Design an enzyme around this catalytic site. Sequence first.
Site, PDB file in Angstrom:
ATOM      1  N   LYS A   1      -4.014  -3.364   0.758  1.00  0.00           N
ATOM      2  CA  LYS A   1      -5.279  -4.302   0.870  1.00  0.00           C
ATOM      3  C   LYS A   1      -6.353  -3.498   1.521  1.00  0.00           C
ATOM      4  CE  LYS A   1      -3.458  -7.135   4.037  1.00  0.00           C
ATOM      5  NZ  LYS A   1      -2.281  -6.334   3.900  1.00  0.00           N
TER       6      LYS A   1
ATOM      7  N   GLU B   1      -7.669  -5.350  13.151  1.00  0.00           N
ATOM      8  CA  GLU B   1      -7.389  -4.502  12.457  1.00  0.00           C
ATOM      9  C   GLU B   1      -7.517  -3.284  13.243  1.00  0.00           C
ATOM     10  OE1 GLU B   1      -5.368  -5.644  10.118  1.00  0.00           O
ATOM     11  OE2 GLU B   1      -6.129  -4.356   8.550  1.00  0.00           O
ATOM     12  N   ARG B   2      -6.730  -2.022  12.691  1.00  0.00           N
ATOM     13  CA  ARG B   2      -6.828  -0.717  13.089  1.00  0.00           C
ATOM     14  C   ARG B   2      -8.165  -0.269  13.805  1.00  0.00           C
ATOM     15  NH1 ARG B   2      -3.469  -0.430   8.876  1.00  0.00           N
ATOM     16  NH2 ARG B   2      -1.109  -0.127   9.315  1.00  0.00           N
TER      17      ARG B   2
HETATM   18  N1  LIG Z   1      -4.483   3.070  -4.772  1.00  0.00           N
HETATM   19  C1  LIG Z   1      -3.505   3.583  -4.074  1.00  0.00           C
HETATM   20  N2  LIG Z   1      -3.161   4.856  -4.405  1.00  0.00           N
HETATM   21  C2  LIG Z   1      -2.200   5.537  -3.674  1.00  0.00           C
HETATM   22  N3  LIG Z   1      -1.771   5.268  -2.554  1.00  0.00           N
HETATM   23  C3  LIG Z   1      -2.087   4.244  -2.253  1.00  0.00           C
HETATM   24  C4  LIG Z   1      -2.956   3.260  -2.702  1.00  0.00           C
HETATM   25  N4  LIG Z   1      -3.377   2.147  -1.967  1.00  0.00           N
HETATM   26  C5  LIG Z   1      -2.541   2.120  -1.059  1.00  0.00           C
HETATM   27  N5  LIG Z   1      -1.858   3.408  -0.958  1.00  0.00           N
HETATM   28  C6  LIG Z   1      -0.951   3.721  -0.140  1.00  0.00           C
HETATM   29  O1  LIG Z   1      -0.325   2.625   0.718  1.00  0.00           O
HETATM   30  C7  LIG Z   1      -0.879   2.829   2.018  1.00  0.00           C
HETATM   31  C8  LIG Z   1      -1.394   1.269   2.539  1.00  0.00           C
HETATM   32  O2  LIG Z   1      -2.990   1.195   2.363  1.00  0.00           O
HETATM   33  P1  LIG Z   1      -3.528   0.136   3.112  1.00  0.00           P
HETATM   34  O3  LIG Z   1      -3.523   0.483   4.488  1.00  0.00           O
HETATM   35  O4  LIG Z   1      -5.132  -0.176   2.522  1.00  0.00           O
HETATM   36  O5  LIG Z   1      -2.727  -1.333   2.785  1.00  0.00           O
HETATM   37  P2  LIG Z   1      -2.696  -2.750   3.722  1.00  0.00           P
HETATM   38  O6  LIG Z   1      -2.232  -3.701   2.920  1.00  0.00           O
HETATM   39  O7  LIG Z   1      -4.035  -2.826   4.335  1.00  0.00           O
HETATM   40  O8  LIG Z   1      -1.808  -2.337   5.328  1.00  0.00           O
HETATM   41  P3  LIG Z   1      -1.689  -3.164   6.461  1.00  0.00           P
HETATM   42  O9  LIG Z   1      -0.929  -4.170   6.359  1.00  0.00           O
HETATM   43  O10 LIG Z   1      -1.034  -2.036   7.339  1.00  0.00           O
HETATM   44  O11 LIG Z   1      -3.210  -3.053   7.042  1.00  0.00           O
HETATM   45  C9  LIG Z   1      -2.058   3.516   2.073  1.00  0.00           C
HETATM   46  O12 LIG Z   1      -2.228   4.392   3.207  1.00  0.00           O
HETATM   47  C10 LIG Z   1      -1.705   4.720   1.017  1.00  0.00           C
HETATM   48  O13 LIG Z   1      -0.566   5.480   1.650  1.00  0.00           O
HETATM   49 MG   LIG Z   2      -5.069  -2.796   6.249  1.00  0.00          MG
END
Ligand SMILES: Nc1ncnc2c1ncn2[C@@H]1O[C@H](COP(=O)(O)OP(=O)(O)OP(=O)(O)O)[C@@H](O)[C@H]1O
Ligand SMILES: [Mg+2]
Lengths: 469, 41, 50
Positions: A160, A186-187
């Site tokens: 996300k 968020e973080r």
């Molecule tokens: N397009 C991408 N290419 C490569 N790795 C990716 C990509 N998108 C996400 N990731 C991997 O997935 C991890 C999670 O991404 P992100 O922090 O944006 O997720 P999130 O859904 O916002 O997480 P959270 O619930 O922890 O906030 C990233 O740190 C990276 O390791």
């Molecule tokens: Mg996130």
Amino acid sequence: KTAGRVVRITGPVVDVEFPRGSVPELFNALHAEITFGALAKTLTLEVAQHLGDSLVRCISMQPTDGLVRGVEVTDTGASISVPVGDGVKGHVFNALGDCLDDPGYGKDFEHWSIHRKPPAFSDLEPRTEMLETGLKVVDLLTPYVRGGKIALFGGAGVGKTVLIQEMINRIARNFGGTSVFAGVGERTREGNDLWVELADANVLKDTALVFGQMDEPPGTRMRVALSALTMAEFFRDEQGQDVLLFIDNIFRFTQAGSEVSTLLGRMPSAVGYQPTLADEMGELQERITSTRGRSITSMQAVYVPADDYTDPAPATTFAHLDATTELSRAVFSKGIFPAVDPLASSSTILDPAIVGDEHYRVAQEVIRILQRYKDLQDIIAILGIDELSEEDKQLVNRARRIERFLSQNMMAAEQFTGQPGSTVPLKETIEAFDKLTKGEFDHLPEQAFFLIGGLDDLAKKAESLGAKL
Amino acid sequence: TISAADIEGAIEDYVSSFSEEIGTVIDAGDGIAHVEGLPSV
Amino acid sequence: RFGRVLDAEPRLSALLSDYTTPAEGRVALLDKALTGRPGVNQTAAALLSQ
Ligand SMILES: Nc1ncnc2c1ncn2[C@@H]1O[C@H](COP(=O)(O)OP(=O)(O)OP(=O)(O)O)[C@@H](O)[C@H]1O
Ligand SMILES: [Mg+2]
């Protein structure tokens, strides 16, 4: 005197008694003092309920640790207000409007109350205009709306925030208007990273950052979104600017509201959420909107608890959005990025009347192929494609290639993989997926379609893999 | 006939005249106690 | 008149309204603040005090 006194303290919720005739109005800001050395501070309390007998129940914006029953409480006579104006651009603020990077900055600015009604219904104008991003899956299957509301649903760690950063890179960099980023629950290190990146890309000067993060009381987490929204509303209404409102994460606002409601003594609703969940969601969301002639393009990250899209929070969030990109753990596990669920994501402007007949037909064929592929997953999981008919085998190969091709090497993904991102024009995306559906790439290997841009990249990767396009 | 000023002096005198804290356990169960008193806690 | 003046000063009424404090102290407060004054009826004084 017209001052109150603390009578009860239960977590970040405080009951304050006032003399009759001096009871503050709902949503008024009150100030109390914590004197203990380590935790000495000035608590800001927001009046939440009138309990009777001149008692008010209030939500604290800071931890109430060290607060004592009986301390004086002063009524400011007004609700929480945040600075507004072009001066907020380029700076970092908290929920109360204090400047973090330059403490004391903005005290002399105009201040707007963070509580206001949404625009009048007669002022609302539906927005049907595609905001092209350069992402194949978004452009093709869930086109974003310029001046509309976009959401990115997803479980934990599906991408996300990376997708929010991708859309900041693609939309906000080449933007002439103002951007407002609201970090909600968020973080903190993510906020610092965003701040540093925006400064590096010279986008900070056009951006206002408002951060209320995980290590905050629920009151701050459920009012920081209102603060950022007030800044965006000033930019929309008082300056006639195009506005980009990025929120991450709105489910955190809902969850903080749930914690506050538990503290306030309300009877829990389903799954333990506050009874007024849909209503709080509605007020906040309907303040985020483009009026007639005044555009806000809002993009919100919505966390899905335990990957449960049935959870009341995202379920009630769904109704407030023009475009919805639902990230999937299943797609994430396959390494496909962005981890979009093409069969679950949607957009209100994906109709032939708006995107044309060619775009619509290609998108519908892609969706049909992917749906037929999902329907066969039961047979394939046990027996593989070998038992399927020739038509089903062909469709399965086509669908696997399509699902690989919907992935893309994102611009924000360079920090992870080290590979630069790519942009794909909408016409090229439509043409390439048209060819994929027809079957003009049925001979290339599947891996040739993984994490690439347009057809040139497909040809180059096929050549590297030993095939020919 | 209303003084309108003796009220403040009288309340101040009463509060002054009225003015270690030790509380008392009133109930206890399952790792939760309730303590009356300790107004400055 | 006593009710009127008590309503006018909500702080005094609230202070007198705390049953936790001893009755004698609040009675003395009222006597030497409002109830006991040259222009106060004895019967009203005693009634309000009790
Ligand atoms: N397009 C991408 N290419 C490569 N790795 C990716 C990509 N998108 C996400 N990731 C991997 O997935 C991890 C999670 O991404 P992100 O922090 O944006 O997720 P999130 O859904 O916002 O997480 P959270 O619930 O922890 O906030 C990233 O740190 C990276 O390791
Ligand atoms: Mg996130």
